[PDB]
Amino acid sequence: QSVEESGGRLVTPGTPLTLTCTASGFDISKYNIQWVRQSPGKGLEYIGFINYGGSAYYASRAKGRFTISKTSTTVDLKIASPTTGDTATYFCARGLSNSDLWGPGTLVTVSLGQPKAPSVFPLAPCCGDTPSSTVTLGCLVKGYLPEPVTVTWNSGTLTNGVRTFPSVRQSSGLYSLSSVVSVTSSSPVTCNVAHPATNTKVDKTVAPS
Amino acid sequence: IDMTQTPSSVSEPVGGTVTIKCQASQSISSWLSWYQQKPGQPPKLLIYRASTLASGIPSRFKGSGSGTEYTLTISDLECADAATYYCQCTYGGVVGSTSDDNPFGGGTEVVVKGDPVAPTVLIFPPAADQVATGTVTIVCVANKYFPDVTVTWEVDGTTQTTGIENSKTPQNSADCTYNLSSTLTLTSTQYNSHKEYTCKVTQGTTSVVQSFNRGDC
Amino acid sequence: CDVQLYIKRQSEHHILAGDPFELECPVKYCANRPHVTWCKLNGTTCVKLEDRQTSWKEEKNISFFILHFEPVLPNDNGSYRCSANFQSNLIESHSTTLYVTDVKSA
Ligand SMILES: *[C@@H]1O[C@H](CO)[C@@H](O[C@@H]2O[C@H](CO)[C@@H](O[C@@H]3O[C@H](CO[C@H]4O[C@H](CO)[C@@H](O)[C@H](O)[C@@H]4O)[C@@H](O)[C@H](O)[C@@H]3O)[C@H](O)[C@H]2NC(C)=O)[C@H](O)[C@H]1NC(C)=O
């Protein structure tokens, strides 16, 4: 069994937002379910839980700001009037005293302004360099908002040694990251970048310079 | 109830022992769980009810305590144990408890010390498609290294003080090593006005330097 | 190689109603795996349970027979044992006690 989440997106402050927790392989409506969030680079913060009979309880700082509810198939977290401080990844989990199954998290961004699609550039070693039997190539994914992007190589078939670095955030609010992969100099590789928030995708074929 | 988790960070050698403490402000009668969290992943339950091991978790992880005092001990430390660890009070879910909070401790970052290894350094000049946008980002990557490094950028010998961003991968699960990406961003006018671009990666008394000349790439 | 079922004396767990939970008992055997069951005490009688999911797991060369609670509920409170009949002898583990704590419901 597993827990899935959805609903994370960019919203302006004060815009109501609902996140959803669903389950595969168990009935989510009949267990205690908790919600926990995490601001980027910070610790876990408990928000509240809904008990197995459908009554919800909250940390004092969350009460009035969040509502947890359930149906026969979902557990929902509603943020009544989001502030920039509510920017975080939100997790739901099965169980409280034995909280065993966790969702992957859904990313909420609360900010003024419109999204920005990434610009993607190939990374190759200087062309004037002596060729080796192996080469490291990459893709730079620059100047997007909000998080996240997805990066794969050769449609997910190339995974060995791939290093996709954590994003960095500029003071403007824009994000960047890079991904690099090491291959033999004989075999071209393609990075697949997608940014769901702007409905964009880029495939970039990278060849040794 | 407030939870006081200490230390906030710890480094221990491979094969060693990590000890993490969580103090509750009043007795919570063993309603306490421990979690492991690796970057980008959800929390993973290790221990619940103070000492009960979660299924699939190795017995190297041991929870102990009662009342206000809780301990997580990780024995025979592996590179795979590099993570941030958290306690959570679960007493708020118990019928009649006064507080409805189920608070987390502040976390403990665990660094696992493997063999030292100097980085292999790569530099990536901006492609012509970048230059045409008016802004260029040069990328330097320090691969497979331990312990931590510092990065300096130089342009025709001048140390750069702005336009630099650094990002580091988690410790490798097999050999404890990091990888780092460092970027330097300049205008195309600035890029075209200089020749030599240098990334210097320093690791205590060791440095590894990689350069390129704009005209050669 | 006699069949043995180990639960430490005074074994106990406290769990919140509404949470997932399982009880485990290590089974020692060498021939065919014995037919193990869980029972729940009612006074002095250990009553065979037949309505609750059981499974087997292998961990570090030890076999475990597992009783699943999906989730635990207040009525699951009580004492449990594993049992098997090995060559005309009833072999039962010591009791493990499951104390179910009611959930916040204010
Ligand atoms: C959940 O189930 C639990 C297990 O059935 C319940 O705990 C039991 O609660 C009763 C009533 O309070 C206790 O009865 C007392 O028993 C002692 C003797 O206890 C000792 O000997 C017995 C064997 O005869 C042994 O099982 C115990 O562990 C002790 O070693 C008497 O002297 C008293 O007069 C009284 O009758 C049980 O002892 C207790 N058992 C355990 C294992 O805790 C619990 O009450 C249930 N909770 C709910 C909410 O229903």
Q: Which of A110, A137, A168 is the endpoint of a domain?
A: A110
Tell me the domain boundaries of chain C: 1-106
Centre of ligand 1 from the C-alpha of residue C78, in Å: 9
C-beta of residue A44 within 8 angstroms of C-beta of residue A61? no
Q: What share of chain B is helix, strand, coil (3-state, %, to 5)?
A: 10, 50, 40
How far, in Å, from the CA of B154 to the mean position of ligand 1? 75
CATH of the domain at A44: 2.60.40.10
Chain B to chain C Cβ contacts (< 8 Å): 24
Beta carbons of B34 and B42 less than 8 angstroms apart: no
DSSP per position, chain A: -EEEEE---EE-TT--EEEEEEEESS-GGGS-EEEEEE-TTS-EEEEEEE-TTS-EEE-TTTBTTEEEEE-SS-EEEEESS--GGG-EEEEEEE-STT--EE---EEEEE-SS--B--EEEEE---TTSPP-SEEEEEEEEEEEBSS--EEEEGGGT--TT-EEPPPEE-TTS-EEEEEEEEEES---EEEEEEEGGGTEEEEEEE---
Is the preceding omega at residue B43 within 30 degrees of 0, hence cis? no
The dihedral formed by the CA atoms of B37, B40, B42 and B45, expressed in degrees to the nearest 10? -20
Distances (CA, A) of A126 to A108, A179, B160, C39: 39, 18, 21, 72
| Number of other CB atoms surrounding residue B32 within 10 Å | 27
**What is the count of structural domains for chain A?**
2
Q: Is CATH 3.40.190.10 correct for B3-113?
A: no
Beta strand A119-123 with A150-153: parallel, antiparallel or unpaired?
unpaired
Residue B101 and residue A46: Cβ atoms within 8 Å? yes
- What residues contact residue B217 under an 8 Å CB cut-off, 6+ apart? A126, A127, A128, A209, B125
Contact state of B95 with C22 under an 8 Å Cβ cutoff = no
Residues A6 and A64 grouped into a single domain:
yes
Of the candidates B28, B33, B98, the residue with the CA atom closest to the CA atom of residue B61: B33
Which residues have a Cβ under 8 Å from the Cβ of B191 and sit 6 or more positions away? B126, B131, B136, B214
Give chain C's largest Cα–Cα span.
54
Pairwise CA distance, residues B102 & A133, whole Å: 55
The nearest alpha carbon in chain B to C18 belongs to B93
Q: Out of A58, A87, A110, pick the residue that ends a domain.
A: A110
Together in a domain, A85 and A141: no
- Under DSSP, the state recorded for B196 is E
Which run of H or of E encompasses B25?
A: none
A177: containing domain: 119-206
Nearest to residue A141, comparing CAs of A171, A116, A111, A161?
A: A116
Structure tokens given for A108 = 């909420």
**Is residue C97 within 6 Å of ligand 1 at its C-beta?**
yes
Residues A126 and A177 in one domain: yes
* A53, A55, A98 member nearest C19 (Cβ): A98
Cβ of residue B171 closer than 8 Å to a chain A Cβ? no
The amino acid that residue A70 corresponds to is K
Which residue(s) pair with B206 in the sheet?
B203
Does the domain formed by B120-212 have CATH 3.40.710.10?
Answer: no
Whose CA is closest to B54, among B34, B37, B38?
B34
Q: CB–CB of A52 and C105 under 8 A?
A: no
Residue A5 near residue A91, CB atoms below 8 Å: yes
- Cα B50 from chain centroid (whole Å): 26
Report H helices in chain B: 128-131, 188-192
Residue A81, C-beta contacts closer than 8 angstroms, at least 6 positions apart:
A13, A14, A16, A65
| Residue where the block lists tokens 């919140």 | C16
φ, ψ (nearest 5 deg) of residue A185: -65, -10
Q: Cβ contacts (< 8 Å) between A170 and chain B: which residues?
A: 165
Q: Is there a single domain that holds both residue A84 and residue A184?
A: no
The span from the CA of A36 to the CA of A66, in Å, is 12
Q: Are residues A44 and A141 in the same domain?
A: no
CB C77 within 8 Å of CB C86? no
Last residue of a domain, one of A53, A77, A110: A110
What is the rounded CA–CA span in Å between residue A178 and residue A137?
A: 11
Domain boundaries, chain B: 3-113, 120-212
| Residue C79 CB–ligand 1 contact under 6 Å | yes
Contacts with B24 (C-beta within 8 Å, 6 or more apart), sequence order:
B1, B2, B3, B4, B32, B67, B68, B69, B70, B89
CB B112 within 8 A of CB B38: no
Among A55, A13, A12, CA closest to A32: A55
Q: Which residue has the tokens 């996709």?
A: A164
DSSP three-state, residue B144: strand
Amino acid (1-letter code) at residue B129: D
Side by side, the strands of the sheet bearing A17-24 are A2-6, A17-24, A75-79, A66-70
Tell me how far CA of residue B80 lies from CA of A62, B179, C27, in angstroms.
Answer: 35, 16, 31
In angstroms, what CA-CA distances link B73 with B22, B38, B77, B80?
12, 18, 10, 15
**Does the beta carbon of C78 sit less than 6 angstroms from any atom of ligand 1?**
yes
**DSSP letter (8 states) at residue C49:** P
| Exposure string over B50-78, b if 16+ CB within 10 A, otherwise e | bbbbbeeeeeebebebeeeebbbebeebb
Query: Strands of B9-13's sheet, edge to edge?
Result: B9-13, B108-113, B83-89, B32-37, B44-48, B52-53
Contact B169 A163 (CB under 8 A): yes
Ligand 1 site, residue C15, Cβ cutoff 6 A? no
- DSSP-derived letter for residue B102 is -
Residues in chain C within 8 Å Cβ distance of A32:
16, 18-19, 71, 103
What is the C-alpha separation between B216 and A63, in angstroms, rounded? 62
What is the spatial distance between Cα C44 and Cα B34, in angstroms, rounded to a whole number? 37
Q: Which two tokens stand for residue A87?
A: 């920017």
Give Cα separations from C7 to A74, B49, C12, C23, C79 (angstroms): 38, 19, 10, 10, 12
Which residues in chain B are closer than 8 Å to A165, comparing Cβ atoms? Answer: 167-169, 179-181
Whether A36 and A68 have beta carbons less than 8 Å apart is answered as: no
- Give every CB contact of residue B208 below 8 A, 6+ residues apart in sequence: B118, B119, B120, B121, B142, B200, B201
CA distance B151 to B153: 7
